[PDB]
Design a protein around this ligand. Structure first.
Ligand SMILES: [Mg+2]
Ligand SMILES: [Mg+2]
Ligand SMILES: [Mg+2]
Ligand SMILES: [Mg+2]
Ligand SMILES: [Zn+2]
Ligand SMILES: [Zn+2]
Ligand SMILES: [Zn+2]
Ligand SMILES: [Zn+2]
Lengths: 346, 346
């Protein structure tokens, strides 16, 4: 008989397989926050139609608990809308928040608040934000609200729905405490990469979300995404991938610091799939003309594809109910397990 | 208390990272035996001197509980001999066995019965067999016992040590049940590959070991190795790798079927490290103009290196004490955790 968590924080590292996670044990200063986890599981990520998943179907597995087609956003294999964990949270009086380092309309965040036939429908997804039950969000994507092809002003619709919107910077908690709902759109498209000076946006915004959503003793659900780990993978760019996931691990530390002190919070860390076939290979040394040989003393990261892969993905869980997440299961069971441990009305 | 295993079976898949494990979920008929595990942990595999380990230091970490230099067999970083789990087991009146699909003198099994400064000293390692307390072994490597530089007949010496030796085939248990010690040397060098018709030697030999060592109600320790998964990795040969790890997963099923019925047996499955950067990438198609694009509906396994990599490696544990093996830790803690749960003393 497991404990029942009041709050849940789901952290998603997009495109991080176990090799990507492992990089933090060789390329980060200090010990990775990954090490705080005891309860570990594995998820199989295939979609309803494809052995190799995309971010949309992979994230909809988590948010809605079904296998669906690549590119689907909160819809079933037949394109019908399906009830999400955010919509369940709202109906159980749970405050909800979403954070990402991509545009907020990108596939991962979108899967938690919208329902669309295709991830490419980003202006539609932005409009869906206005009819969602989200109480908090932070990410990029200002363009999809204020520079649309349909020239509509969705910002104004957002505010007309009780959202306080900031497009300048993240503020402290006291700045927004009196607000009913809070949205941060801090970039036209994607937030800056770590290498271009994003700094600790992800941890800070996650921390902000926790404070805001736990106002007045309220239970909360947060999804925070380290979005750009995936983009380093596609680019086969090791320093990009590594800096992005180091930042993600920082965010884990933030969620865990709150959970350990709160004692009523379940923290789940996982990924939607792996990308690039990132590998912590031996550093390649030279010499005159044997030319190229392997030196096992050090690591020289390599890649084998420009796209995703179907490896199983690690799941990490800490807090009340975390035991439910061990063993091996389908990605969509994440949803059903969250629902199980929280005991929320379906 | 909960709980003390009487017996331990350690199954080592040489060179299998999570991606290699994952192939069993796409390329094997039926559900992988991997799915039987609930308790899962992760190990860091770096040696005492190298970020990227080899099979010798990697296995010595398991067998002797210390970090050591690449190529070391049952010796510490300063090259001094250290007590292995097989020796400790003997001291505690525990029967012992080693099974491998490579030569029985190869790095992995050797680290469990021999002590040598370098893994390449295989004729010395075969001779070390004569001074170990091993009760049972099965594998290849007949050459290292009978066609040696020193022209000695090591089988003669073993037979003096109460070994019965079979160089013809795996037999029924009734053929060996009255032997005091049993050794199978079923190939001159490595056992045949699955593709060349090795069949279920690995499962069969493990079953034989269990039945033989649990004679007279004795407790036992067994290490069985899926030795050739690694060679598949080095060769960047996908069918070779996958067929070898599917065989390994059959061995898992064999061990678990016994353990579940026995109720007093701890089964640990892990790997020494990953090799080849094996990746379950999307199938690559060619458009007669630009050629390469991805088809996410199917998998096309790819590789990115010819050597090992430093990814964290999954640990699976079932049975009494299995909870001790979760979380993230150094590879050499495998030794200490086994001792802790078995209460095998020094
Ligand atoms: Mg994403
Ligand atoms: Mg770079
Ligand atoms: Mg080996
Ligand atoms: Mg082949
Ligand atoms: Zn993704
Ligand atoms: Zn991607
Ligand atoms: Zn190895
Ligand atoms: Zn190797």
């Amino acid at each position: 008989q497991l404990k029942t968590p009041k709050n849940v924080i789901l952290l998603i590292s997009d495109g991080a397989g176990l090799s990507q996670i492992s990089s933090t044990f060789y390329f980060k200063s200090g010990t990775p926050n990954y090490t705080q986890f005891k309860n570990i599981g594995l998820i199989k990520t295939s979609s309803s139609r494809e052995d190799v998943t995309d971010s949309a179907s992979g994230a909809t597995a988590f948010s809605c608990g079904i296998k669906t087609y690549n590119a689907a956003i909160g819809v079933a294999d037949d394109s019908t809308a399906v009830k999400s964990i955010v919509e369940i949270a709202a109906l159980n009086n749970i405050k909800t928040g979403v954070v990402a380092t991509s545009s907020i309309t990108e596939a991962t965040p979108a899967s938690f608040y919208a329902h669309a036939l295709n991830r490419g429908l980003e202006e539609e997804i932005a409009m869906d934000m206005t009819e969602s039950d989200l109480d908090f969000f932070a990410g990029g994507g200002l363009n999809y609200f204020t520079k649309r092809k349909d020239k509509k002003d969705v910002l104004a619709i957002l505010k007309g729905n009780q959202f306080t919107i900031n497009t300048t910077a993240l503020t402290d908690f006291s700045s927004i405490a009196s607000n009913r709902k809070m949205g941060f759109l801090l970039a036209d498209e994607a937030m800056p990469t770590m290498e271009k000076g994003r700094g600790n946006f992800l941890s800070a915004a996650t921390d902000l979300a926790i404070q805001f959503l736990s106002k007045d003793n309220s239970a909360f659900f947060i999804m925070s995404e380290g979005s750009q780990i995936d983009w380093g993978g596609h680019a086969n760019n090791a320093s990009y991938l590594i800096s992005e996931i180091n930042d993600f691990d920082d965010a884990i530390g933030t969620a865990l610091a709150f959970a350990k002190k709160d004692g009523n919070t379940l923290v789940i860390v996982t990924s939607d799939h792996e990308t690039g076939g990132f590998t912590l290979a031996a550093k390649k040394n030279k010499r005159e003309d044997g030319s190229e040989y392997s030196d096992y003393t050090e690591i020289g990261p390599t890649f084998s594809t420009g796209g995703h892969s179907a490896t199983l993905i690690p799941v990490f869980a800490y807090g009340p109910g975390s035991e439910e997440f061990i063993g091996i299961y389908e990605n969509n069971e994440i949803f059903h397990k969250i629902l199980k441990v929280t005991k929320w009305n379906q």
